Amino acid sequence: TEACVTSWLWSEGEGAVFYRVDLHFTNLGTPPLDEDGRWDPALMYNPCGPEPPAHVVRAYNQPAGDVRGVWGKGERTYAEQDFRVGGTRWHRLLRMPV
Amino acid sequence: TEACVTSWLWSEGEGAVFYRVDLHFTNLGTPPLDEDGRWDPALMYNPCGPEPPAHVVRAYNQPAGDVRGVWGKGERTYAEQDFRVGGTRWHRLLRMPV
């Protein structure tokens, strides 16, 4: 059972990039578990692919904490995080709920 | 349909839920503010839906340190987080390539 939400992300400087990210959320209900009751999905299931470039993925999946701006209006509002990853500055807009 | 990575997110306790998240990446070219300075209409345009429930989204984006790194079908590296938010304990896996 499916849901989705969209992010945006872009870097600065020479060779700057700009991506849309559609996060497709799938509810797996109650999957099979081991003893104790632990799930090990990274090893159980096949990942999607082919992968985007390495540095783009590291940047999107970076922790960054400091919400530094709020974009958009009304019901479609986005939190901006602003961070560097090895000399490259990134901006990442995340949908923020109510 | 272009470039893709996978994440995993799950909770413990009664009402535990389990989710696969596929992150679809679409290269949009140059960062959205040009030197003129006009905006790319692609930015925040046509967000996907419907959106996942608020506690799920919040959990997915909660700041949390990496507990450990794991593999990963095909020796693919993931960062793991183990954290609590809203009284609920969550586990999270994020694709993190080098």
Residue numbers in the entry:
A (entry chain A), B (entry chain B): 24 to 121
Q: What's the publication's text?
A:
The structural components of rubella virus are comprised of three proteins, glycoproteins E1 (58kDa), E2 (42–47kDa), and the capsid protein (31kDa). In this report, we have used a combination of cryo-electron tomography, sub-tomogram averaging and in vitro assembly studies to elucidate the three-dimensional structure and assembly of rubella virions.
The third structural protein of rubella virus is the capsid protein, which interacts via its amino-terminal domain with the viral RNA genome to form the inner nucleocapsid. The cryo-electron density from about 20 isolated tetrameric units seen in the tomograms of the in vitro assembled nucleocapsid cores were re-oriented to a common orientation and averaged. This showed that each monomer of the tetrameric unit has a dumbbell-shaped structure. The structure of the C-terminal domain of the capsid protein dimer was fitted into one lobe of the dumbbell shaped averaged density of the in vitro assembled nucleocapsid tetramers using the EMfit program. The two top fitting orientations for the capsid protein in the averaged density are 180° apart, relative to each other, along an axis perpendicular to the two-fold axis of the capsid dimer. These best fitting conformations of the capsid protein are similar to the orientations of the capsid protein expected to be facing the viral membrane. As the N- and C-terminal domains of rubella capsid protein are similar in size, the remaining density of the averaged dumbbell shaped unit must be the location of the N-terminal domain of the capsid protein. Using these fitting results, it can be deduced that the disordered residues at the C-terminal end of the capsid protein, not seen in its crystal structure, likely correspond to the thin strips of density visible in the cross-section of rubella virion tomograms, linking the inner nucleocapsid shell to the membrane anchored E2 signal peptide in the viral membrane. The dumbbell shape of the capsid protein also accounts for the double-layer appearance seen in the in vitro nucleocapsids.
